[PDB]
Scaffold this active site. Structure first.
Site, PDB file in Angstrom:
ATOM      1  N   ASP B 252       0.919  -1.113  -0.051  1.00 21.05           N
ATOM      2  CA  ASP B 252       0.075  -0.084  -0.024  1.00 21.05           C
ATOM      3  C   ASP B 252       0.933   1.129   0.022  1.00 21.05           C
ATOM      4  O   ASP B 252       1.992   1.204   0.517  1.00 21.05           O
ATOM      5  CB  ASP B 252      -1.281   0.046   1.081  1.00 21.05           C
ATOM      6  CG  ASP B 252      -2.101   1.145   1.076  1.00 21.05           C
ATOM      7  OD1 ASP B 252      -2.426   1.661   0.073  1.00 21.05           O
ATOM      8  OD2 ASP B 252      -2.220   1.691   2.003  1.00 21.05           O
ATOM      9  N   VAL B 254       3.286   3.290  -1.165  1.00 24.23           N
ATOM     10  CA  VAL B 254       4.555   3.247  -0.997  1.00 24.23           C
ATOM     11  C   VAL B 254       5.095   4.739  -0.657  1.00 24.23           C
ATOM     12  O   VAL B 254       5.882   4.954   0.090  1.00 24.23           O
ATOM     13  CB  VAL B 254       5.495   2.253  -1.964  1.00 24.23           C
ATOM     14  CG1 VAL B 254       4.895   1.128  -2.370  1.00 24.23           C
ATOM     15  CG2 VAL B 254       5.521   3.154  -3.073  1.00 24.23           C
ATOM     16  N   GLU B 283       1.638  -0.081  -4.763  1.00 25.08           N
ATOM     17  CA  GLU B 283       0.728   1.023  -5.119  1.00 25.08           C
ATOM     18  C   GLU B 283       1.651   2.326  -4.907  1.00 25.08           C
ATOM     19  O   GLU B 283       2.289   2.569  -4.114  1.00 25.08           O
ATOM     20  CB  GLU B 283      -0.470   1.561  -3.955  1.00 25.08           C
ATOM     21  CG  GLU B 283      -1.287   2.271  -4.511  1.00 25.08           C
ATOM     22  CD  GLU B 283      -2.086   3.000  -3.107  1.00 25.08           C
ATOM     23  OE1 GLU B 283      -2.234   2.279  -2.156  1.00 25.08           O
ATOM     24  OE2 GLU B 283      -2.465   4.253  -3.455  1.00 25.08           O
ATOM     25  N   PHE B 310      -3.892   5.176 -16.083  1.00 28.59           N
ATOM     26  CA  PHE B 310      -4.773   4.464 -17.115  1.00 28.59           C
ATOM     27  C   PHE B 310      -5.943   4.413 -16.719  1.00 28.59           C
ATOM     28  O   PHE B 310      -6.790   5.124 -17.566  1.00 28.59           O
ATOM     29  CB  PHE B 310      -4.280   2.960 -16.951  1.00 28.59           C
ATOM     30  CG  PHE B 310      -4.584   2.083 -18.189  1.00 28.59           C
ATOM     31  CD1 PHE B 310      -3.811   2.180 -19.260  1.00 28.59           C
ATOM     32  CD2 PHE B 310      -5.711   1.566 -17.868  1.00 28.59           C
ATOM     33  CE1 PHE B 310      -4.424   1.495 -20.410  1.00 28.59           C
ATOM     34  CE2 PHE B 310      -6.215   0.599 -19.038  1.00 28.59           C
ATOM     35  CZ  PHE B 310      -5.525   0.564 -20.459  1.00 28.59           C
ATOM     36  N   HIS B 312      -8.039   6.503 -14.708  1.00 27.96           N
ATOM     37  CA  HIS B 312      -8.602   7.847 -14.763  1.00 27.96           C
ATOM     38  C   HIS B 312      -8.949   8.237 -16.196  1.00 27.96           C
ATOM     39  O   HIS B 312      -9.929   8.826 -16.676  1.00 27.96           O
ATOM     40  CB  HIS B 312      -7.761   8.847 -14.246  1.00 27.96           C
ATOM     41  CG  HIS B 312      -7.657   8.420 -12.934  1.00 27.96           C
ATOM     42  ND1 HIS B 312      -7.683   7.236 -12.589  1.00 27.96           N
ATOM     43  CD2 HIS B 312      -6.989   9.141 -11.820  1.00 27.96           C
ATOM     44  CE1 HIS B 312      -7.285   7.226 -11.354  1.00 27.96           C
ATOM     45  NE2 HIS B 312      -6.844   8.296 -10.813  1.00 27.96           N
TER      46      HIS B 312
END
Lengths: 557, 557
Positions: B252, B254, B283, B310, B312
């Site tokens: 999670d 990072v 992430e 990607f 969004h």
């Protein structure tokens, strides 16, 4: 582009001001104007009536007036009205200053000369020139508060010292040293800002809130609008370079500079300098090769960095000192290690920090590092700025000097040191805000047990240099520096180092050398002729065999 | 080594406790003991009478009792007494999980199955197995507060979920999927910790004070005793790997992990995993190649990272959405760029962040990235966890799916998504401390305008999965996944992408593909046979020429 800028008969008034809705230029003598708030936050105005060596002030929403934080000059004081000045404009694409020939002279314009200005320092040029010094390192001149500061409370990155003479002065100072073949090097602060007269704090977000250094906080190179703050700075370098033909830079406490961007602001900065074929050095605690390392090796490419490790090993060795950082060293071994593996903390346990400090320097030349037995920090932070002369016997003090100048490193002398100077270098400040002129007191007092009231003129003058030459010391140096050159000792780390209980013989490419801290037998493994000694007890022509020596230092060939 | 450890008939009780002077082991049933304060700060005790599946608690100076923060199991609850358990011990030096064949299935054990446990998830294996999924991504199981949390308030890194079944369960879950040829992947939190029941805070300094993330603060990988805290963690990985044959990890956020050390804790961690020939994904917000990049290129070597960019581009394109991050995109171009240059922010202005975001990905395979149209974040943070089905027309939703699975990237499906699931994924929490069960409220409420009281059981169950298959959607997927494999689309970014006003043809190695968002003329430059379409309006055998198409998606050959 951040302060002003003269076209033809035109001056432009740029102004990073995100947080402001309306700001007003205010030539003090002329009038008040309305800025051009742009989407980014840059109020702005264009002038032509001005040319004037005019004092101005930005007047914001709030109702307050202030000065261009990219002020080129703060004549009246820190709260002084910014002011207009010509465009130094000329400089050259190069510094005569090759590295290998680096001898640094850390100078504090203030306490230096009794004048305590550029002029002051100008007088001593030839003295310097003589000594053998290759370049001058000027402590921070970024407009500080008052008249008496080491210069670490600077608050006007763009503005040159009132006191110290200012602009023209600084201007001249360089032009001068230039002539005398002396290289000038500026020591800049980019990891924080003076606690007095800093307005940034209102114009927008110059400093990051995500983090906290010790001297408050660093700037914003990361979040929000890092773009702008990180531009401030990068330009700020280019200026010195262009408006002052400066020869290089020294960066205070880089490790207080936090950047997460894909391009660390350091490397960012390095680039700027190397673009002007200038030179950068940084003060760096982190025993990290990264800094100095090359790009191809994932390094910011800074030219060279200080190595406090070297110091301490020596200092705490000679002195019986073991306080604060001292505890990580104070032993013969440390000295040799530092001698052949730059860092003493190559990735190991510092009880000092209770952490696992630093890491292997690579295979970088000794010229990526800069060694020294003295500097403002090392002297300054003692609470009684004891010079090193005052804590070691004379033979010792002579030895030290040897060590550090006979290193492959990049020797740099504190001012005073070469002629045997004994006044302390105290911690002094000239702050106006009561609360600081107080905080500061229990500070130093609690931090360094400094009894001297930094705010006391005494403390200041007491630190001034007593130009009381001591040809014994003074001579020595002069040679050392000369021997070094002669010798071809610089940068080269291809060195053999031996040591006995209290001694240390060190071959080099073309020479050897003896360091004896105490009467002792030595199996000298080589034959050469005496080049120089601390004492007289040294054998003009030496040969391999067991001999007994006396506390001193001698140099073969 | 941090919790306990069984020798023979012997158990050891390690305990990082710098700040404590005296701590006491306290088998709940047996007695209270005295630890072995070592210089580093590690109280300690050795036992043999214990073997017992015993509940214990450390009792500190203060007078309080607490649980092993490296607790292997917190049966009773977060304040539950830590507990003893066997040594899973066996695992294999490898994951069958090659990358190229990666289909990820983000699953939230809780709201998944009506059971909401490993068992629950076990039942669905074969379903999964069928779907075509290559691996399962388990949301965070690190012992959280209560029973209803996404799992981001975990506070017992070493301790497996009470609720979710726990240890054996998790144990089985893997052993199971293993059998079914399913790869399991754990999603771990190392950038922060749950706001409830975190005791670290007393034992010593696990978290750094120098910085502040958003969810409070990250740990201490830098200052003080980083050694210890940074060991916690690195071991923490090795455990999962050894005590659970886990197949890989997902990290999670990072970018909330701050490390200045010469070796970033990431790279530190990566190493651990790659040592066990496992896999790591992270992430990461920072559009920085650094992460995923290889060592030789100065990268931490993480295996692959999520690419919210990607998403969004697609989402905001299909939806007319432009809120929060949405503002940086929502346009055809964005979609293609992301398609051929991983990041949409390759180093450019994000008005969203008012900064100059990210930087060029290199020439890394599409398999360093993992794309997706849905995930807990993307759904979860909406205030009304709207699934994407609820904001785009069906043709669209079919198209999307195409895009993301037909990418060179590493497609991963949110749970529910494949069968056309419509319940929301809300934000739910199960906190005991009044002040949080309140903060949390105006939080989500202010942060995401979430009306649902996360603390309301409703909100929870409402998010549970309604296993209401929709063979229309369900089928599609199944193929897509199958086509992808068949097709040889994975990792490969050697792709030509064309686009017209509202269309997008995309050649690949062996195929083409049409994306038409609106009736329009297309100069199709190639001949192939229909492989699959959203609609029926698609020409089984195609040839190069101008044709008019209808909102839909078709796949050639």
């Amino acid at each position: 582009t951040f302060a002003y800028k003269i076209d033809g008969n035109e001056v432009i008034f740029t102004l990073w001001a995100p947080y402001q809705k309306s700001v007003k230029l205010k030539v003090l003598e002329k009038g008040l104007y309305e800025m051009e708030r742009d989407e980014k936050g840059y109020f702005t105005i264009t002038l032509n009536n001005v040319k004037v060596r005019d004092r101005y002030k930005y007047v914001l929403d709030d109702a307050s007036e202030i000065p261009d934080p990219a002020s080129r000059y703060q004549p009246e004081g820190v709260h002084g009205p910014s002011q207009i000045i010509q465009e130094s404009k000329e400089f050259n694409n190069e510094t005569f200053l090759k590295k290998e020939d680096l001898i640094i002279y850390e100078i504090h314009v203030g306490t230096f000369t009794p004048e305590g200005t550029f002029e002051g320092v100008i007088r001593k040029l030839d003295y310097l020139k003589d000594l053998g010094i290759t370049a001058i390192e000027i402590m921070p001149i970024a407009q500080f508060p008052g008249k008496r500061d080491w210069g670490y409370d600077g608050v006007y990155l763009y503005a040159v010292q009132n006191s110290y003479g200012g602009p023209e002065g600084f201007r001249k100072l360089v032009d001068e040293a230039h002539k005398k073949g002396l290289g000038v090097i500026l020591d800049v602060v980019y990891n924080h800002v003076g606690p007095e007269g800093n307005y940034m704090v209102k114009l927008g977000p110059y400093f990051s809130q995500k983090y906290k250094t010790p001297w408050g906080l660093t700037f914003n190179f990361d979040d929000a609008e890092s773009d702008e703050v990180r531009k401030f700075i990068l330009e700020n370098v280019e200026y010195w370079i262009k408006e002052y033909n400066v020869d290089g830079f020294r960066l205070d406490a880089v490790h207080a500079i936090i950047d997460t961007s894909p391009k660390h602001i350091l490397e960012e900065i390095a680039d700027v300098v190397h673009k002007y074929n200038r030179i950068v050095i940084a003060e760096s605690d982190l025993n990290d090769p990264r800094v100095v390392n090359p790009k191809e090796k994932c390094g910011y490419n800074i030219d060279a960095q200080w190595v406090d490790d070297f110091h301490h090993s020596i200092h705490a060795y000679l002195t019986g000192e073991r306080q604060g950082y001292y505890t990580d060293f104070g032993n013969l071994d440390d000295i040799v290690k530092s001698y052949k593996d730059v860092f003493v903390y190559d990735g190991k346990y510092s009880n000092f920090r209770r952490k696992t400090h630093g890491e292997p320097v690579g295979e970088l030349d000794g010229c990526n590092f800069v060694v020294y037995i003295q500097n403002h920090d090392q002297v300054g932070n003692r609470g009684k700025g004891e010079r090193i002369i005052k804590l070691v016997d004379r033979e010792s003090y002579k030895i030290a000097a040897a060590l550090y100048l006979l290193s492959p490193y990049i020797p740099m002398i504190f001012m005073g040191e070469e002629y045997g100077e004994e006044n302390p270098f105290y911690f002094f400040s000239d702050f106006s805000d009561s609360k600081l002129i107080q905080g500061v007191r229990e500070g130093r007092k609690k931090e360094n047990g400094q009894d001297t009231d930094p705010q006391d003129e005494s403390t200041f003058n007491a630190s001034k240099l007593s130009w009381k030459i001591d040809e014994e010391i003074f001579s020595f140096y002069k040679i050392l520096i000369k021997m070094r050159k002669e010798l071809s000792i610089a940068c080269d780390r291809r060195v053999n180092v031996v040591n006995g209980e209290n001694w240390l013989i060190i071959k080099g490419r073309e020479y050897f050398s003896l360091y004896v801290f105490s009467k002792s037998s030595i199996e000298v493994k080589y034959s050469g002729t005496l080049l120089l000694s601390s004492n007289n007890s040294f054998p003009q022509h030496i040969e391999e065999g067991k001999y007994e020596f006396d506390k001193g230092f001698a140099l073969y060939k």
